[PDB]
Write a protein that binds this ligand. Structure first.
Ligand SMILES: Nc1ncnc2c1ncn2[C@@H]1O[C@H](COP(=O)(O)OP(=O)(O)O)[C@@H](O)[C@H]1O
Ligand SMILES: Nc1ncnc2c1ncn2[C@@H]1O[C@H](COP(=O)(O)OP(=O)(O)O)[C@@H](O)[C@H]1O
Ligand SMILES: [Mg+2]
Lengths: 125, 470, 51, 578, 578
């Protein structure tokens, strides 16, 4: 019975953390319909191009194509647009065998460990 | 952070693959591998250079082609997400849970290889444990903080002995003189290549004694991939060190079948063309077994403890093989099972001669269990070794040509094997075991008992076997 | 033996029912505690994900 | 589709260039004849094909064509009463196609695509099907071959073709995804077929012998291993397991051993009769042959084909018995391809992953409940052939850690023509503690204690025989000689079985229990009569000792009327004793 | 200095490039954390570096900064009552800085830079100093730690700081040139310290254990080697030598062994009392501790730091013991690092320079007269751990050549708890002819004849062992049976010694001389009494055997008052016997 109540409590906590994950998923899904989207695209694209030493090309959205246009015609970087990459940018570095993706859902998936470790003690402490 | 993919795998064979143009991968880093079907395998980086990099792959190597299968980076050093609400859960070899419950919320991220413990910041393993087994209580005493494995064969019941120790090990607080609380044991159960029958026995034993609310299991079945066996004991002992030294539990670690771990590292060390030690096992197997075993014991000023019981399957049931030999060089003591006593019908089949607890002298004696204990142990060993080496003399001159006291040793031997070793599933405390040892020592007169002092032999001698039970 | 068998059945059922009820109460209580406390943390994760 | 050419040929190794994007462990048609090989060691733009056929006469530049699918068996109706080779093509269709010799690279379909099978559906249109769920049934021989959804297919049934008769490639259930479900399906042999839950084995695998079910039993989901040098049985015991068992179907996979055994099984099975449903014995055996003169890289695949077929008949509700014959020859095949691939050996040439491959083979046996709800089991008996006797081998000590029953054969005990040559002092079982309630409800009530008395008599005689070889039969006291005589009656009545006699080839649990009661009644009532003043040289020459000794030659129907009269004779031939 | 970048990381091995101008066996700061490494195999413009911590999280491109010096110890006041790791970092300071886990990249000084010392000088301004000459004097735990001119330092003293309290950094002697001489100096670990002359050894190293000091002795300038299997008695013997021997200082080198058996030495040595003084036992020991889970490349450094610290205390006039356990772990560490060098090995896998390393290690002992004129000694007791239990290994049969005083531990005497498990048949000592006049002067005059008679009785026992194991303990005559029973009483009452009883852990050789004199008096008078004719097994039932048996338990204070009574009881019991 003690194992039953402990599994009940942890399985109740899991769906709460999952729906908070869904809320931040919709928060950064309905985010490009907002004028701070070119600013955040320029910021994360410059972070991807600087964390990749000497890139060659960049892959983005067509709608996200002009918003880094000032960074397009400097650094000597090729540009390309794809609709599959709905979020974030991609940087192909100097040969085609090294690639840096900077999607928003990707950043959520990378940082969600320490994010959840702070979220649980934030909303349960 | 940001996704860092590496295309350009040059070579894939066995457990290894090579990725070129890979400089931001660190040594010891963790990579994951995505093929064209979305299946994400894991792997660890084990050689880095400006030309290429070498990855050991933690799963099967089916469907990995070279035109695809990007290699991405995660956890620049290999870590494990550890928590305190981890004590009713099951995990696979990498640490992903297989119980239906959601993954845990990590309270820390500890490095999975584990740093070595400072010899100044240790503490003597001191406190007597009792395991209800008369051999491991009177003759080869386990104490809290010790690393003692069970050296066994192939048909021998080492798993039943480990489960019996796990279900009846209790410290004795009243004989020790530290008061009383009866703090029970958390159990960390790492298992590497348990088939289905051993796993069924262990989980039925744990759920029958009510221990799966105190235990955490890192399971690795026989058909699971044979490279995650390298990470299984290290992430078991990461959780054990966490629970003992940052929450002050009393963790007992059952490390099943270390011979499968050693053959897994033989596989990954023969994939890399490395010069071996003895019988094909690589030269650094001493260092790997040391970095696993030596992560146990007690520290100073802190309430915790990591006690270790590994289990070894000796291949040709000999002490000479590199796996049990190097194991016995790192660890402190062994409990060695004998096939010679198992065919006679004796459980637990422990012959006391090759088995030895090293630091028994820190947990026995006056004011800890009882003042006669070490001398009783020495006299039991002397008299039973006389019985064992007089059986050969009986075998080469026949039965009737014996002096008296030689038949008395020959009767001490089988009375020992049929009454002191041979018990059932019964839990016998240290007083029943000491009075059965004294009742067997009463079969020999004074003057042969030249290792027990005179006050002990004056106040304990003189009880037969018809008074220790009926 | 019949007496202790029926006593085992009655006591085990009467204790397991209270365990089920305490489990349901604990799950509903932790959900209602977590729901009103929410939307503080979504700003935290949305601030730390974004550059 | 990837089509490259050959770069290098060395034995069965074909290093092929131009293979870029070729997945590992695929099946590729190497050579312009259509040779079957499997891709390992990707290196740059270059594969490494182990071919599963002969490899002579290939030139450099011939096309290798990768198919992009792993090694997969066809699983459906048309398999029982079947002989296959190591890549599942039937040998009888080959000899009716080619000749009496096994030529190189002939393509046939593993199932018969002109056999007309009677369909009877069990899924009405509109239902939802998961993996492993039964769609319908086919009457095969005397069995009921239920066909089932592949384990990676989930959907809703759009249409069902009605209850007629069809070919195995006729799409009988079209799901509402476009997916047609046929009567057969292909499955990769290195992937274990999934289950719902693995149970615990609690019902013995009745081998029909007397030393391999009484003293050392294997349960229904158990694993067993038979070592032993040459001339020590090891083939008649495997064929006795294949003949006289309680298993529903038998997959007899023989890799690396001689072909006279294969033609012996093919000749003398259709004349016999299994004692379960009647009809021929061959209508439940699927036998896979890879003879030692046949190619050597294919006996690796033979084992996986055999255990996948056993798992297929396990996933329907049966109780399969797989006899895997000379897995040491499979270890030699792995040694061959490992040394051809330039790998480091470990302990006499075998690759370091040998124990891992061997554990992944023996782990597939088990007592499970399938995905269709029904329960099934598959047991594995692996004959291992260590070279010089010498049980310290890598293959033997690697298979010894995982199996649950170890049946050691001797060479000193098969030179007295004491068959079966199982060493009763050195073999062991681990299913004895689990099969005790089945014994107490299905053979006797005091059956485990009678067995333990037999075992301790054998242990006592074994300990006593060395001082007999010291001093002779003189200085034995009086009971020291009666232990020897009862032990010899045991090892010449109970622990000895002909398998060529008509009636002493099968032995149910009742007949072995009756012989055990006769032996222990003789010992119990003669040791109590040896202390009322009877010579040991009188107790042996009774006419009832022959009635014990020939008790293993009576039928299963004559035996209870023989047993109660023999108990009357044993109880009455000691009352007149003086 | 010599800047390079990391090119390749594989295990505890870093290839750097751009290091052109670096020398062999230097020290490198590898990485941004500043890990300590050592250059072996420089080629082209690269350098292979073995790192003395673990590399995990390093990556290519990180800089390597060379130093230009080999590995050097700091030698000065402040090493007694101290524990260091393999590169001489004091571990108590590391526990103060870090927590309970030993981290990498931490930097501490070996000697305390904050502790004051009580300098009193011996040189005056206007003196001539050569290397090894004393300068002053500092107290250290009662020890008179005298401060030496470093070797290869010659000059004339300009000024000397007056007597007072000073730190170790303060230049206490400024020479006529610009040279200043602090209280410490660094010294490499592969250049053995210079010396004036090497004496021949004529004074035993008193262990305290009876067998290792009577039958197989060690001179004060001699080496000794104790091999044996696991569980035989190596580490308990070496802690007994660390606990009871007559060394002025003791250097204990844990080279790749347990941490619990260094925690034992840290905890229970301050509770004890050093003989020859009154201060505690921890105040005379230095403790180098490179345990098993510490990084493997530091074990060579750990085995050299101990021998150069022992040479430093030799150069002050002390008599140093060096207990180095597990030189085979240093051999295994060399094997693991030679695997990264992709070299070709000798037998068993070890690199071929192993016995040159062992000869250069064991040759650094041996009773010298130092550069300062006064005499000192280092005596090295080395534990060898044979891998298979067999003493037929490239380490064991190399130390077996280059050592005297070999002490072989068998497992058969350790299965039965007969400690110490010294195999008498496989042990020797080459010093029994050099310690003879010291025995005749400082033990008794008839001591070595008594020792040789003990040795020939053990030889006669080991000669009769063939016959008594073939035929039996009976069918001997009475003299041979008396020899076998006297051999039993020697092995149980003189050789056996448990190292946990209060009395009988230490044994002066007056006491061992008394025990041997009693056993020989018993043997010769029983032999004379059995030639004229008395029964055997009434001499085995005499009550003086209790006196000879308990003779090793009585204290050394009342040992003459026990010895005279026991000897008179021997003659009286044999006189009243007839
Ligand atoms: N000389 C001795 N006196 C008393 N007990 C001993 C002695 N030598 C060994 N023992 C017992 O056996 C154990 C042997 O340990 P140790 O010698 O360290 O093994 P190894 O030498 O293989 O490292 C000790 O812990 C102790 O219990
Ligand atoms: N086929 C292989 N691929 C990659 N590495 C290998 C292969 N065969 C051997 N090795 C490893 O390469 C290492 C060679 O060491 P080396 O390159 O000289 O210096 P470092 O160890 O610093 O890289 C050996 O440790 C060996 O284990
Ligand atoms: Mg040791």
């Amino acid at each position: 019975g003690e194992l039953l109540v402990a599994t009940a409590r942890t399985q109740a906590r899991g769906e709460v953390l999952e729906e908070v994950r869904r809320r931040v998923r919709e928060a950064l899904e309905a985010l490009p319909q907002k004028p701070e989207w070119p600013e955040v695209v320029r910021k994360l694209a410059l972070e991807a191009l600087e964390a990749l030493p000497g890139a060659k090309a960049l892959v983005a959205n067509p709608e996200d194509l002009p918003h880094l246009e000032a960074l397009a015609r400097e650094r000597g970087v090729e540009l390309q647009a794809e609709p599959a990459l709905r979020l974030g940018v991609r940087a192909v570095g100097a040969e085609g065998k090294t690639q840096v993706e900077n999607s928003l859902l990707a950043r959520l998936d990378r940082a969600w460990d320490a994010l959840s470790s702070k979220v649980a003690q934030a909303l349960w402490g | 952070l940001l996704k860092k993919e590496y295309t350009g795998i040059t070579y894939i064979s066995g457990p290894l693959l090579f990725v070129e143009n890979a400089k931001d991968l660190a040594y010891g880093a963790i990579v994951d591998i995505k093929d064209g079907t979305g299946r994400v395998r894991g792997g660890q980086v084990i050689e880095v250079s400006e030309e290429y990099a070498v990855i050991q792959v933690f799963e099967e190597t089916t469907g990995l082609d070279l035109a695809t299968t990007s290699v991405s980076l995660v956890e620049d050093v290999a870590r494990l997400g550890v928590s305190k609400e981890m004590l009713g859960r099951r995990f696979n070899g990498i640490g992903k849970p297989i119980d239906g419950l959601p993954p845990i919320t990590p309270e820390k991220r500890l490095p999975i290889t584990g740093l070595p413990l400072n010899p100044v910041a240790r503490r003597k393993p001191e406190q007597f444990i009792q395991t209800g087994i008369s051999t491991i209580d009177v003759m080869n005493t386990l104490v809290r903080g010790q690393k003692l494995p069970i050296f066994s064969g192939s048909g021998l019941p080492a798993n039943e002995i480990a489960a019996q120790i796990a279900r009846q090990a209790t410290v004795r607080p009243d004989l020790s003189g530290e008061g009383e609380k009866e703090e029970p044991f958390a159990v960390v159960f790492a298992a590497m290549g348990i088939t289905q029958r051993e796993l069924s026995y262990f989980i039925q034993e744990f759920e029958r004694t009510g221990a799966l609310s105190r235990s955490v299991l890192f399971l690795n079945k026989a058909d699971d991939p044979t490279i995650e066996r390298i990470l299984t004991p290290r992430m078991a002992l990461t959780v054990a060190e966490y629970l003992a030294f940052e929450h002050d539990y009393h963790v007992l670690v059952i490390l099943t079948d270390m011979t499968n771990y050693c053959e897994a590292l033989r596989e990954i060390g023969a994939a890399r063309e490395e010069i071996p030690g003895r019988r094909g096992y690589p030269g650094y197997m001493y260092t790997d077994l040391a970095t696993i075993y030596e992560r146990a014991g007690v520290v100073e000023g802190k309430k915790g403890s990591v006690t270790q019981i590994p289990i070894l399957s000796m291949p040709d049931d000999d002490r000479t093989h590199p796996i049990p030999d190097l194991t016995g060089y790192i660890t402190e003591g062994q409990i060695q099972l004998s096939r010679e006593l198992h065919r006679k019908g004796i459980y637990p089949p422990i012959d006391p001669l090759p088995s030895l607890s090293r630091l028994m002298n820190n947990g026995v004696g006056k004011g800890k269990t009882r003042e006669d204990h070490k001398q009783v142990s020495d006299q039991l060993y002397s008299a039973y070794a006389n019985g064992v080496d007089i059986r050969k003399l009986v075998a080469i001159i026949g039965e009737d040509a014996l002096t008296e006291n030689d038949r008395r040793y020959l009767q001490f031997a089988d009375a020992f094997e049929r009454f002191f070793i041979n018990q059932g599933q019964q839990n016998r405390s240290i007083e029943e075991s000491l009075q059965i040892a004294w009742a067997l020592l009463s079969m020999l007169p004074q003057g042969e008992l030249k290792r027990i002092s005179k006050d002990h032999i004056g106040k304990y001698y003189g009880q037969k076997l018809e008074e220790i039970w009926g | 033996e019949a007496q202790y068998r029926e006593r085992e059945r009655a006591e085990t059922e009467a204790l397991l029912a209270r365990y089920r009820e305490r489990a349901e109460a604990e799950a509903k209580a932790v959900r209602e505690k977590a729901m009103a406390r929410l939307d503080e943390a979504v700003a935290l994760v949305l601030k730390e994900v974004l550059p | 589709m990837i089509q490259g050419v050959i770069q290098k040929i060395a034995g069965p190794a074909v290093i092929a260039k131009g293979m870029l994007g070729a997945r590992m462990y695929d099946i590729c048609k190497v050579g312009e004849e259509g040779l079957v090989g499997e891709i390992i060691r990707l290196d740059g733009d270059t594969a490494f094909v182990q071919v599963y056929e002969d490899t002579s006469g290939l030139k450099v530049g011939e096309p290798v064509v990768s198919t992009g699918l792993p090694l997969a068996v066809e699983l459906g109706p048309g398999m029982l009463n079947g002989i296959y080779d190591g890549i599942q093509r039937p040998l009888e269709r080959i000899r009716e196609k080619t000749g009496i010799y096994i030529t190189r690279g002939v393509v046939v379909h593993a199932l018969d695509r002109e056999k007309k099978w009677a369909w009877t559906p069990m899924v009405k249109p509109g239902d939802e099907v998961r993996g492993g769920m039964v769609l319908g049934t086919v009457p095969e021989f005397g069995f009921t071959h239920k066909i089932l959804v592949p384990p990676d297919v989930r959907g809703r049934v759009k249409e069902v073709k009605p209850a007629g008769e069809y070919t195995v490639e006729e799409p009988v259930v079209v799901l509402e995804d476009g997916t047609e479900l046929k009567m057969y399906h292909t499955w990769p042999v290195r992937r274990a077929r999934p289950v719902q839950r693995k149970l615990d084995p609690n019902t013995p695998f009745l081998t029909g012998m007397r030393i391999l079910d009484v003293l050392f039993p294997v349960a229904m989901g158990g694993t067993a291993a038979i070592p032993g040098p040459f001339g020590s049985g090891k083939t008649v015991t495997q064929q006795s397991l294949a003949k006289w068992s309680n298993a529903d179907v038998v997959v007899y996979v023989g890799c690396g051993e001689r072909g006279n055994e294969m033609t012996d099984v093919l000749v003398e099975f259709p004349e016999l009769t299994d004692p379960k449903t009647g009809g021929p014995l061959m209508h439940r055996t699927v036998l896979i042959a890879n003879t030692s003169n046949m190619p050597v890289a294919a006996r690796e695949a033979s084992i996986y084909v055999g255990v996948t077929i056993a798992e297929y008949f396990r996933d329907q509700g049966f109780s399969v018995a797989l006899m895997a014959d000379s897995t040491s020859r499979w270890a030699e095949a792995l040694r061959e391809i490992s040394s051809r691939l330039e790998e480091m050996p470990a302990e006499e040439g075998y690759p370091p992953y040998l124990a891992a491959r061997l554990a992944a083979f023996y782990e597939r046996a088990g007592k499970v409940i399938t995905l269709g709800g029904e329960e099934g089991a598959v047991t594995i008996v692996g004959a291992v052939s260590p070279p010089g006797g010498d049980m310290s081998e890598p293959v033997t000590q690697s298979t010894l850690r995982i199996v649950g029953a170890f049946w050691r054969l001797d060479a000193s005990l098969a030179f007295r023509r004491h068959f079966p040559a199982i060493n009763w002092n050195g073999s062991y079982s681990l299913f004895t503690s689990a099969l005790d309630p089945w014994y107490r409800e299905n053979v006797a009530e005091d059956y485990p204690e009678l067995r333990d008395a037999i075992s301790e008599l054998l242990q006592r005689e074994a300990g006593l025989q060395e001082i007999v070889q010291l001093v002779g039969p003189d200085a034995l006291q009086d009971a020291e000689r009666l232990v020897i005589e009862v032990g010899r009656i045991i090892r010449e009545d109970f622990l000895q079985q002909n398998a060529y006699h008509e009636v002493d080839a099968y032995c149910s649990m009742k007949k072995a229990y009756g012989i055990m009661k006769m032996i222990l009644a003789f010992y119990k009532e003669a040791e109590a009569a040896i202390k009322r003043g009877v010579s040991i040289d009188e107790i042996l020459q009774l006419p009832v000792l022959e009635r014990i000794g020939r008790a293993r030659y009576v039928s299963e129907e004559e035996f209870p009327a023989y047993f109660e009269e023999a108990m009357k004779e044993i109880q009455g031939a000691f009352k007149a004793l003086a």
